[PDB]
Amino acid sequence: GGTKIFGFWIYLMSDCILFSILFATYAVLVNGTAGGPTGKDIFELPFVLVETFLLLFSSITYGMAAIAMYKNNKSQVISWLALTWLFGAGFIGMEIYEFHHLIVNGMGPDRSGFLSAFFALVGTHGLHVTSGLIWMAVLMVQIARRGLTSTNRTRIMCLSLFWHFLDVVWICVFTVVYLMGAM
Amino acid sequence: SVKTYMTGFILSIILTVIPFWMVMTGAASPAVILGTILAMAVVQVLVHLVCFLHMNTKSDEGWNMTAFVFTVLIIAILVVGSIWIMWNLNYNMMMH
Amino acid sequence: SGCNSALLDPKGQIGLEQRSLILTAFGLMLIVVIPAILMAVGFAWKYRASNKDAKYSPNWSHSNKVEAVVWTVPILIIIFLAVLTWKTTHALEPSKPLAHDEKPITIEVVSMDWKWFFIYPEQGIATVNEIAFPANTPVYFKVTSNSVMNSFFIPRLGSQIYAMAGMQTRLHLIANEPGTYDGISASYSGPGFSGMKFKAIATPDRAAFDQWVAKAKQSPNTMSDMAAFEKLAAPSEYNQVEYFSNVKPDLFADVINKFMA
Amino acid sequence: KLSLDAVPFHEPIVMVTIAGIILGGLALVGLITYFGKWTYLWKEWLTSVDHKRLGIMYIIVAIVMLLRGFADAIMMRSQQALASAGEAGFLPPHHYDQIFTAHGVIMIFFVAMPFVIGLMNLVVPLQIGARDVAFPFLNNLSFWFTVVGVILVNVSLGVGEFAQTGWLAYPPLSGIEYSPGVGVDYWIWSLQLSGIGTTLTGINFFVTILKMRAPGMTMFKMPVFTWASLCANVLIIASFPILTVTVALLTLDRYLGTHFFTNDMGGNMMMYINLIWAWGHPEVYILILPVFGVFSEIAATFSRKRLFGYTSLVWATVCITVLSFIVWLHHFFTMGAGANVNAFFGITTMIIAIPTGVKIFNWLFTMYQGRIVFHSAMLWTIGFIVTFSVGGMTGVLLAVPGADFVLHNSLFLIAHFHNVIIGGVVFGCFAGMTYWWPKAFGFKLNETWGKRAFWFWIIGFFVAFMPLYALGFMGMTRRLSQQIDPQFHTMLMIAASGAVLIALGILCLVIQMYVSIRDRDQNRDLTGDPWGGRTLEWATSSPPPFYNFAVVPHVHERDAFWEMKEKGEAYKKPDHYEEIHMPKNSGAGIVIAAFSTIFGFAMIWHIWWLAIVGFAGMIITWIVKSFDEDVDYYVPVAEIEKLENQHFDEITKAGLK
């Protein structure tokens, strides 16, 4: 039972290593602006801010879902999971919206090394959030079909680790790629 | 655990708003803005670890904080070795 | 370990110091590795399973006496090797100005596609798969690549450096003895990698290097304009030695600026 | 839309003979499966969530890919011997450059990683007194990801090419502009799937060792192979993600046209070498630590003496685990970095040699004052000490930056890493085969052919790579295929002869695998505890039960089984056998891997429609397997009685208790 949570925790440590590699790649390639955007002129910090407490609220509503899972209510866990999925879907939509206003322009990942590394770091965080959204949808389906009986509350406690680790990675992301790029 | 999540909700908001405010509105020399956003990000990361991830010394007989400490050490080694090496590399690759 | 090889008996000061370092490091580890092998065979023969008169003592795990020397002797050999490593790494590094009383000859190296290009900015000469420098005169190499990473390497002169596109690496070499020294790329670069061999004719005196330059200045073809470089940078595996009369005043920089931009 | 695949596979060349031989062998194996056991292979292997069968299949894949890797290496030695002082060889530069790249990739990721993972999979759950790994379905899936990597690196031989960049695919040559072919795509999409499988293996074994231990076995009461596997799994967890990133960062370089490592528009190629070696050396210690545990167990077992330096031999393993992440720059000393970083990483590389030396001396003193029986495994251990000491000594000779500036990519580096890899991992993976063959399969390997294989291997290696040290000292660099030099001909011919001797050694190992199976009945391990045995894996029957333990023994001491043999309480009829839940075999590992093979082959060749339905085939099966609720079955106590009584029937037939 509790081994799965520990196994997912050390997989999250592996993902910490992966994101650290991506962060090092960005921190080295950040100055590789081949006569293109310097990051300061394209990051649009307010658009990040609405994003950053759109994934911050998602961790809090997943927390509510988890503490309801400690209780026996299933409607509350499904409602909080749906709210978390809505917030995560909004976050991913904003990520695509920012990308769709960079790839349509001559600002894509092929434009420069800096843009490639920014696209890789933020797109990998977004692919982790999208994997979390698919996992949350599947877990909601399982909860509806079977309930918080067993190996479904274990999945809740592994997806809580996943989602909160994702929000910590995004804390590092908005601290480093965004923000610091624009002074 | 309602209190700890809400404790990690106002703290998270107040440590994810002041960095954005300091950066967007300036009001501080670059060196204080960077140091303060970095400090607020390390503190917000620790708040999310202790409040949201429910990190604790005992866990399942250690091996969670211990695993996280080892992972942080390896992340720091890898990042500072991929910046220090590449700073020394990129310096020695110039016309100079 | 060939006695008359390139690594052993080098013909360069930065290679002679390199061979001294290799020998002293190899000696430092013999007094440890040789006891290891000698005990691996000695314990096996002495104790065996049929040598019934040996002190067959099982369940003897801990020995503060034995483990102490077992930990300390590698510690001492590695502390001495680390002091030596620090000294010889801050001493034998490339980009070290080689501490000589002669003006270093600047040879701008460009590892093109399965050939080597050399540009003497001061002499104006440009050569393919061939260099020349006076004997006991420092030579300064601005090694860069044009297509893919290579490794400028003259094994007899010692020390190699990496040639990367858009990046200038500094390599100071010197030839204590006159003669022809084989040169190679030590980093695999493609199908023509086995053909990236150049010759380093260490002329006996500055007069023979002026003769070699004058011979190169008699080449009808000249290295003028960057468009010629692209013609020479065309993929070709085994290129014969080719000389160029004069070069563009800053051609090596313009090679790096193709990539650095 | 077949997209980039098209008709040209390898027709104008004589690799179609190799492809036809492979197809004929596959057809023969298919027929042999057809008449005889065909559902058994599906129902007991190939779907297993049992650590013993997954480990055996890992080792079988390792041997089968070792045959191809050594074929590539004998072709390389023949080409280099012919080219030196002679005309061009049978391999043009195009083909030969796929030979060293495929040799290094197959040998590292599909001959050494699977062999070490198979040994760990087979032994660690037994040694720690665990019925199965912590994640029994993440073990079959990881094995099948190793298999999809194997399938991709073998399809590369027939369809397309397998990269002409090197076994790590340095960035500018592996870029889409200088390697527009599908070879680097085969490299990327085999290595990434294999790395995912290996990361899952590392997670599984880390949780198994930390959480599935028998009650009473503390951290410092575990066997030393368990400590070594724990350290190698720490490294797998903390290093293979790097391999997942950089390769993926190369993938976006070749597919999306990004500029992480392109030398054109701001990308930094030197970053790829930094990342690939920050993974690479930790992967080297991932390969060497488990065979350090294997040799610790074999020396303690065949010296009839307690392992000398357990606390020192566990703390040296942990120091190697933690110090292997500060060393990696010693792989690119000649990049042009400053003296400070080069000196620091050289000093770190020399400081990571004290723990290995401490381990070597601990094994030497384990032999000291012991009853050293010269079994084939003990011969492998002695040869490992003798060869690995030389390989490490030459490794620290390349660890001084002042000497790696002149020996970086010579044949001295080839001799270093081949000396350590062979006399380490390969000797450990053959000594584990000999040592744990009774504990997986009930018969014992033929000791006569095992000794012959060891002697052929040791002699051939000492005359196939000792010449390479001289060639490295002579200025020969690594990947020379055409027109090497006249001076290099003598040592390249001696190296070719040594490679032939190693071929004879591999053939003697194959004959040992055949002469033993042929004599599977004219030898046997009735007791379950052959060759003495001090750890808690020999307390079971020789073909250990599917649950592998019916009591989860109390241990409460370091050696465990040696203690209970000494004080009598070794073979005790337990009595009441409680029902124990064992994971149910699931074939969902095969399909998820199979779509991965659909995903990989449709990503190497640009059939995006098949990759979309291949990537979405992995996910939906993962979703479907999530819905599955029957994941474990309780084995009836009647079967536990039948198997345990059968084991004690043989214990009693002999000395018993």
Ligand code: HEO
């Ligand atoms: C798993 C196999 C394995 C192992 C165990 C090692 C172990 C070591 N390796 Fe190697 N290596 C391995 C496999 C490789 N190495 C490589 C590359 C490589 C390079 C690259 C240099 C370059 O790229 O130019 C260096 C410097 C070393 C050094 C070392 C050292 C110092 C050790 C030490 O850990 C050895 C420690 C053991 C010793 C030292 C002997 C026992 C100790 C005794 C007896 C006493 C100790 C005390 C003293 C020595 C004072 N290795 C490469 C890649 C080559 C390439 O493609 O570029 C591979 C595959």
Ligand SMILES: CCCCCCCC/C=C/CCCCCCCC(=O)OC[C@H](COP(=O)(O)OCCN)OC(=O)CCCCCCC/C=C/CCCCCCCC
């Ligand atoms: C056509 C679709 C296109 C989609 C494009 C966007 C990318 C989507 C990627 C989705 C990846 C898969 C998401 C997870 C789906 C499965 C979830 C699941 O099974 O949850 C339960 C599952 C198993 O629970 P048990 O109780 O053990 O189950 C017992 C029975 N088996 O819980 C877990 O612990 C699994 C956790 C899964 C974590 C997944 C993490 C994914 C990380 C992605 C990294 C991406 C890196 C960037 C590169 C991406 C490629 C370019």
Ligand SMILES: CCCCCCCC/C=C\CCCCCCCC(=O)O[C@H](COC(=O)CCCCCCC/C=C/CCCCCCCC)COP(=O)(O)OCCN
């Ligand atoms: C597109 C780019 C290239 C990559 C393509 C492939 C992408 C990944 C495809 C899926 C891989 C992972 C499959 C995971 C399957 C389920 C794992 C699982 O739940 O295993 C359980 C254990 O449960 C766990 O959750 C395992 C421990 C925690 C593991 C967490 C990580 C799992 C893998 C996530 C994906 C990793 C790779 C992501 C992409 C990386 C970048 C390419 C096994 O124990 P049992 O008791 O047998 O479970 C019941 C079985 N009926």
Ligand code: HEM
């Ligand atoms: C035991 C029989 C083996 C022989 C005869 C052998 C021989 C060779 C030869 C001739 C080369 C090419 C050297 C060069 O031209 O630079 C080579 C390269 C290599 N071998 Fe082996 N090898 C063997 C086993 C192994 C094993 C067991 C491994 C590791 C598991 C391995 C890993 C490598 C690697 C990584 C390379 C370099 C690949 C590259 O440069 O891209 N080999 N080997």
Ligand SMILES: [Cu+2]
């Ligand atoms: Cu290394």
